[PDB]
Ligand binder design. Structure first.
Ligand code: FMN
Ligand code: A1ELE
Ligand code: SF4
Length: 363
């Protein structure tokens, strides 16, 4: 209840604690997780990726081979609407974010869908999102947050946004190479000390100085209050954490509650991805199937990312990311694809979102 962490302003919104729960697809950070996180006073973030899978394709107009047909159904507006409404049944009008990656067919469509669903903040990575305000202009109060890997990207994004829209980002998330999901670094760079989050954050904060000290949120490998305090002492205004929340009871992908307490460090690895960035996965499910010669058949149905070119890169790397993550959300241990931060092996007990926030904020 008593904390020395101070509330964080992002645009017109305020969160009690300077903590983001990072967005996680597919079906990992939806209404239960984000709702309870926001209820606790942190920023709950709803992933807008693969919402067609929500409640086993409850809100898709067409299904092929048990998959949402095309990007209009993979990124389902009605599903997103219901997820946000259900989250607000828990967290009321407490701020909620919507996370949507840049490298998609229909980026503006999904951003505006998130705004119309009630998002207070849009968070976008997996690319250089130089045009978020173009699609946000009808929603003046929604804060816009790019995820970056470098101070150079901060400078570029601010200059482009300022020149074109007379607006700059409301915050920046700098994500390091210990994070879950995809990495904003080449595989070889993920292991180099120059790109450790403790080295990225000071550079991004110094670059931020020139544009009015836009708040900086450090993400990737942050485990406990000590890591939070380190990042804050390096100039960050807040932190974004995901793996800790991946190990909470309120996680919307229930499989993780059984997978994480058994997870060993040697079973976490960086793999190739149809998205075109290294992805940090657990060596289980579809990965194992690929190595046995029983890889699921690949034929693009959901058209989930532009860099893949409708199955070309999926066939090259050996798996479809939409199919695998959807199967994971639907409970497929044999063929699901499972992601984790580097810290995933440190999850022993599955605890409540409430006790996690208490651990992170007490004192
Ligand atoms: C399971 C999992 C799924 C993720 N999916 C996404 C995603 O869809 N979009 C995104 O921007 N980041 C994604 N990430 C990255 C997180 O939002 C977060 O920035 C990162 O994991 C923070 O590091 P930590 O996990 O050590 O706290 C994912 C991370 C994990 C662990
Ligand atoms: C449908 O495709 C899917 C399925 C699951 C997850 C995703 C996804 O978008 N995964 C992510 N993982 N980390 C992300 S990050 O934006 O925080 N870092 C980052 C990473 C790379 C580059 C830059 C600039 C920043 S995005 C997409
Ligand atoms: S084949 Fe490629 S573009 Fe199509 S759903 Fe799979 S990963 Fe996405």
């Amino acid at each position: 209840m008593v904390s020395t962490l101070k509330p964080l302003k992002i645009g017109k919104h305020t969160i009690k604690f300077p903590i983001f729960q990072g967005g996680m697809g597919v079906g990992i950070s939806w209404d239960e997780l984000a709702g309870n996180v926001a209820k606790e006073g942190a920023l709950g973030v709803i992933s807008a990726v693969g919402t067609g899978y929500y409640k086993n394709m409850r809100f898709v107009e067409r299904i092929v081979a048990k998959k949402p047909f095309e990007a209009l159904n993979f990124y389902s507006k009605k599903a997103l609407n219901e997820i946000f409404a259900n989250a607000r049944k828990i967290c009321g009008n407490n701020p909620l974010g919507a996370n949507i990656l840049y490298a998609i067919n229909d980026y503006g469509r999904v951003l505006r869908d998130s705004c119309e669903a009630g998002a207070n903040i849009i968070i976008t990575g997996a690319g250089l999102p130089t045009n978020m305000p173009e699609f946000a202009k009808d929603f003046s109060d929604v804060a816009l947050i790019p995820i970056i890997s470098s101070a150079k990207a901060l400078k570029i994004l601010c200059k482009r946004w300022s020149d074109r829209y007379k607006r700059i980002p409301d915050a920046f998330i700098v994500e390091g190479p210990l994070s879950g999901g995809h990495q904003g670094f080449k595989y070889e760079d993920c292991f180099k000390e120059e790109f450790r989050l403790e080295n990225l954050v000071p550079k991004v904060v110094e670059a931020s100085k020139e544009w009015g000290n836009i708040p900086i949120i450090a993400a990737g490998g942050i485990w406990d209050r000590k890591d939070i305090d380190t990042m804050l002492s390096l100039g960050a205004s807040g932190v974004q954490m995901a793996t800790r929340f991946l190990g909470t009871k309120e996680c919307d992908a229930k499989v993780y509650a059984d997978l994480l307490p058994t997870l060993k460090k040697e079973d976490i690895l960086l793999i190739k991805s149809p998205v075109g960035y290294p992805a940090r996965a657990i060596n289980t499910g579809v990965i194992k199937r690929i190595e046995e010669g029983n890889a699921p058949k690949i034929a693009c149905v959901s058209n989930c990312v532009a860099p893949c070119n409708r199955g070309e890169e999926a066939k090259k790397v050996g798996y479809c990311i939409a199919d695998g993550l959807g199967r994971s959300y639907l409970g497929n241990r044999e063929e699901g694809l499972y992601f984790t931060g580097a810290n995933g092996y440190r999850v022993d007990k599955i605890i409540s979102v409430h006790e996690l926030i208490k651990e992170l904020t007490e004192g």
